[PDB]
Design a protein around this nucleic acid. Structure first.
Length: 1026
RNA sequence: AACUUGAAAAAGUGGCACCGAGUCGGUGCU
């Protein structure tokens, strides 16, 4: 029946789940293949994939290759050729002299009505297609996507969204005037950095500006890399250098680097259109002609000049090609030639405009110089359109194939290269491929029936404790800068430490300068518990738990009685204090605006629309790309028109929606317990996406992928909360889009508003949410103990390295008599011998010395091959002599929630104290979890020394506080965790890794070949082979 | 992953409801 899919995509996992119209995950009878007596199994349609990053065949296939670059280039050339040659089917000295560059022919073809040579116009168009530029901007060029001003604004907004703490605010800056100025790149960088007080070029933003200008920044000092990273936009190695950089630093900065690239493109476009003599012209080719004219004029001038003052060294400059001459520059670079010629210009007297052309990097430039491939393809399509309008009457074929050649130029399964030509670490590409084929397997499981909904969310990487100090460093820098700006010795009277600043209450206490933000008397240092946290924009309107929307006060009642932002009574008293905090750079401008919004009318309709945008729209570009890939692969049907019918709808959300859902409705997640959390996140993805999509059908263009009818906010918002709600077609007065799950909504005044127990759409009368039954369903699904976890098996390609272990039965010679005895061994195939192994295994094994090898059961065992043994314990084949743990401890959701609450004990007061009481009441859950993990370890782990040592440690440490107990149980879960054993630390005792050096047991165990979703199983009984 | 057809690019194979839940079990149907 009707169902949907949720996805939680990361660099190491792909979570998936399927929910029906009642938000239940189906269970199905799945066939089991192999040579056992078990021919069926019950499986839950929820699970997750795991895959460790590394070098593999797929990893190499996902790498950018000049080979595919060049082959699709020749393909484009072949299309254009075939066209022009079919048209044809149905001198060099003159060409060189009157066409010194292809750009000359470009411009004269754009601006000439006379008949031109067919081979020459063919060459021009072939150049157009072969060098077409990037597709980073969608649609036709307009000021909206061209102006350097707003594109710089987009870059700074992207940076601010990428941080949202310690941001940079640029409103009075004149980006067009600064960047568009015709000067040197270094001086332009200096001038731009001068206008932003906060940072310099050495910083991330300074280096991004330098890259957008055209310099060669290094990100070593910025991102703490042990290996230097040089990035040049003109270099052809920029793509792979950026890929490696993002692999080292994280994949969330791809949008930042793309925004910098777009700013550079805007700079190039503004400079190239700067010389626009005629509107109906081709600015690119025209400025190229002007550049070549400057080249020729300066060449002739220098030839004449080296003669008057000094005829000598004329050979060294023009003919030698000896060390670094101008002929050397035309023979191979720019900075090298500049360095060579700088002493010449310093020595030569009366130097002039040649110098300004040199240091402005516009002197004697070649045809294909740096910053020429960055031109967008819209310039080329407009140029071709002008060409076709010029030559429309002569050639009927170009009139016939206008749209044909346009679509050939603009058109961009080829999944591997499609994902390779992207912006991300060479692990997210593998993860996206995993996701695509997981969805393929799921839709094949459901009998080629397509889902109604596919929710997409990129799993946020957990803090690796390396970034846990980075944010502390920036917050200490911010607080010291602000406190120095003000002058109150608060840190002198009460010093703090980076770690201590992770407490939200203390951080807000210091951001409010140790003084109450609403009431004019000093706050008590040693009485922080009695204080409360207030949200400037109430959660009933906006879900924002960051520092930007948090303040600290003695009582929430001081904000006033109204449900909007605080009244003007306290504003009049504390305007000076708020202004001082703004000038200290401790409080951001957006925070100040949301503070003073009452004086500007209060919360407005445009603000509510913007809050919907912030809570509902996804900005991360790779998410749009993966949604595009999935939608294109999913919906392939059209109608008589040229519009795509959307039978399957691709749904995109943020990580904050599901996180807040879990926090609000006690579907808590602890990822280290087992690998079920990816699947649970996918399930919540599907549930939330389906519920939102059925509750609000007119918000498609906000988050759903596709070309829908754009909508406005007037039809979305009711005039009054009570007098208009439940009486009109307006969906919501409250901009917190998460409302319809809640049965009770707390307001800013305290009135707890109630909403119907069952949720339905007014327009179609379709019930969407029954708050009791659906909640019980979600709890049951999260408590379901069978979730499919699969670790990807891969062959290693590229102390020898073993490609894969091989399982073989053969004969060996034992003893002096050389009597043949039956033998069963685990043999490892190194990378070097792998090719010969596939070439001739029988001969290869005979050479190694095995006799009477049966070709039938020579079994290929990749890495992490799963083995199941007595009592269902599982082991994975790590190497030819080591094994890894292969089981999952399915802990009930009651202990899962207990572990979450106990671990986050310290991190509304009523629900907080209720949760604290719930934690304190259930002390026996600690011993229950200990018993559960002990029995699971006896069942599957079989490391008696580790079990008894850790049990002794727990018995010694029984009376310690519950928070520490729960955290150390979380650490203890390492013993039962999937994969390779690793040492873990309890309160004081360290339990070393129990390596599975013995590997003879898997020779008689049961091998299981898992599919990517884990639903299709092939279980082979190895003991029967012999 | 595994299985089958192919030199290769590449194509194909895993029934449906209910009651349940310790890594899935049980019942009806086919």
């Amino acid at each position: 029946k009707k169902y949907s899919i949720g996805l939680d995509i990361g660099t190491n996992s792909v979570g998936w789940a399927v929910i029906t119209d009642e938000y239940k995950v189906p269970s199905k009878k799945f066939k089991v293949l192999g040579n056992t007596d078990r021919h069926s199994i019950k499986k839950n349609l929820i699970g997750a994939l795991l895959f460790d990053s590394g070098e593999t065949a797929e990893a190499t296939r996902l790498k950018r290759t000049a080979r595919r670059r060049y082959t699709r280039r020749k393909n484009r050339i072949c299309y254009l050729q075939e066209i022009f040659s079919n048209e044809m089917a149905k001198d060099e000295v003159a060409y060189h002299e009157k066409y010194p560059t292809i750009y000359h022919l470009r411009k004269k073809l754009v601006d000439s009505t006379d008949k031109a040579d067919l081979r020459l116009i063919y060459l021009a168009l072939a150049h157009m297609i072969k060098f077409r530029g990037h597709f980073l901007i969608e649609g036709d060029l307009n000021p909206d996507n061209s102006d350097v001003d707003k594109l710089f604004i987009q870059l700074v907004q992207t940076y601010n969204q990428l941080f949202e703490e310690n941001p940079i605010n640029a409103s009075g800056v004149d980006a067009k005037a600064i960047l568009s100025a015709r000067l040197s790149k270094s001086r332009r960088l200096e001038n731009l950095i001068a206008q932003l007080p906060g940072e310099k070029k050495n910083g991330l933003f300074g280096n991004l500006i330098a890259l957008s200008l055209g310099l060669t920044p290094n990100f070593k000092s910025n991102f703490d890399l042990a290996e230097d990273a040089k990035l040049q936009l003109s270099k052809d190695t920029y793509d792979d250098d950026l890929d490696n950089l993002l692999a080292q630093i994280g994949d969330q900065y791809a949008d930042l680097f793309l925004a910098a690239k777009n700013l550079s493109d805007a700079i190039l476009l503004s400079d190239i259109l700067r010389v626009n003599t005629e509107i109906t012209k081709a600015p690119l080719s025209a400025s190229m002609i002007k550049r070549y004219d400057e080249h020729h004029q300066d060449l002739t001038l220098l030839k004449a000049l080296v003669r008057q003052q000094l005829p000598e060294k004329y050979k060294e400059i023009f003919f030698d090609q000896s060390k670094n001459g101008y002929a050397g520059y035309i023979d191979g670079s720019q900075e090298e030639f500049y360095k060579f010629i700088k002493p010449i210009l310093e020595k030569m007297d009366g130097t002039e405009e040649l110098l300004v052309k040199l240091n402005r990097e516009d002197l004697l430039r070649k045809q294909r110089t740096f910053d020429n491939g960055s031109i967008p393809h819209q310039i080329h399509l407009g140029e071709l359109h002008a060409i076709l309008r010029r030559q429309e009457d002569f050639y009927p074929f170009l009139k016939d194939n206008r749209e044909k050649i346009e679509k050939i130029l603009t058109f961009r399964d080829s999944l591997h290269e499609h994902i390779a030509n992207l912006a991300g670490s060479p692990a997210i590409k593998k993860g996206i491929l995993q996701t695509v084929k997981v969805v393929d397997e799921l839709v094949k499981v459901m009998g080629r029936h397509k889902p109604e909904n596919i929710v997409i969310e990129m799993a946020r990487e957990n803090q690796t404790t390396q970034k846990g100090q980075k944010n502390s460093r920036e917050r200490m820098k911010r607080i010291e800068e602000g406190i120095k700006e003000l002058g109150s010795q608060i840190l002198k009277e009460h010093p703090v430490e980076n770690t201590q600043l992770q407490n939200e209450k203390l951080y807000l206490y210091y951001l409010q300068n140790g003084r109450d933000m609403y009431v004019d008397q000093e706050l008590d240092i040693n009485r922080l518990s009695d204080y409360d946290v207030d949200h400037i924009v109430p959660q009933s309107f906006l879900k924002d738990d960051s520092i930007d929307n948090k303040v600290l006060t003695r009582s929430d009642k001081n904000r006033g009685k109204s449900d909007n932002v605080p009244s003007e009574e306290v504003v009049k008293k504390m305007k000076n204090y708020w202004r001082q905090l703004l000038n200290a750079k401790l409080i951001t401008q957006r925070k100040f605006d949301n503070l003073t919004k009452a004086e500007r009318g209060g919360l407005s309709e445009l603000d509510k629309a913007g809050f919907i945008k912030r809570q509902l729209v996804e900005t991360r570009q790779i998410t749009k790309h993966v949604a595009q890939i999935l939608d294109s692969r999913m919906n392939t049907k059209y109608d008589e028109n040229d519009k795509l019918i959307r039978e399957v709808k691709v749904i995109t959300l943020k990580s904050k929606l599901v996180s807040d859902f879990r926090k609000d409705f006690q579907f808590y997640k602890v990822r280290e317990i087992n690998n079920y959390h990816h699947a649970h996140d996918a399930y919540l993805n599907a549930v939330v996406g389906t519920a939102l999509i059925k509750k609000y059908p007119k918000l498609e263009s906000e988050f759903v992928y596709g070309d829908y009818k754009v909508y406005d906010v007037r039809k979305m918002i009711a005039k009054s909360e009570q007098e208009i709600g439940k009486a009109t077609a307006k969906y919501f007065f409250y901009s917190n889009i998460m409302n319809f799950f809640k049965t009770e909504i707390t307001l800013a005044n305290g009135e707890i508003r109630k909403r119907p127990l069952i949720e339905t759409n007014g327009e179609t009368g379709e019930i969407v949410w029954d708050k009791g039954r659906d909640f019980a369903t979600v709890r049951k699904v999260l408590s379901m103990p069978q979730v499919n976890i699969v670790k990807k098996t891969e062959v290693q390609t590229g102390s020898p390295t073993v490609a894969y272990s091989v399982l073989v039965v053969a004969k060996v010679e034992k003893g002096k008599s050389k009597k043949l005895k039956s033998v069963k061994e685990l043999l490892g195939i190194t990378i070097m011998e792998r090719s010969s192994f596939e070439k001739n295994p029988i001969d290869f094994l005979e050479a190694k010395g095995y006799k009477e090898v049966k070709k039938d059961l020579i079994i290929k065992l990749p890495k992490y091959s799963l083995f199941e043994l007595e009592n269902g314990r599982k082991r994975m084949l790590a190497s030819a002599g080591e094994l890894q743990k292969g089981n999952e401890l399915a802990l009930p959701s009651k202990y899962v929630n207990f572990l979450y609450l106990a671990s986050h004990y310290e991190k509304s007061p009523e629900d907080n104290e209720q949760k604290q009481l719930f934690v304190e009441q259930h002390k026996h859950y600690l011993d229950e979890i200990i018993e559960q993990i002990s029995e699971f370890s006896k069942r599957v782990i079989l490391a008696d020394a580790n079990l008894d040592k850790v049990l002794s440690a727990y018995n010694k440490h029984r009376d310690k506080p519950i928070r520490e107990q729960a955290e150390n149980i979380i650490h203890l879960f390492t013993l039962t965790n999937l994969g390779a054993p690793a040492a873990f630390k309890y309160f004081d005792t360290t339990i070393d890794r129990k390596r599975y050096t013995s590997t003879k047991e898997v020779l008689d165990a049961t091998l299981i070949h898992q599919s990517i979703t884990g639903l299709y199983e092939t279980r082979i009984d190895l003991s029967q082979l012999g």
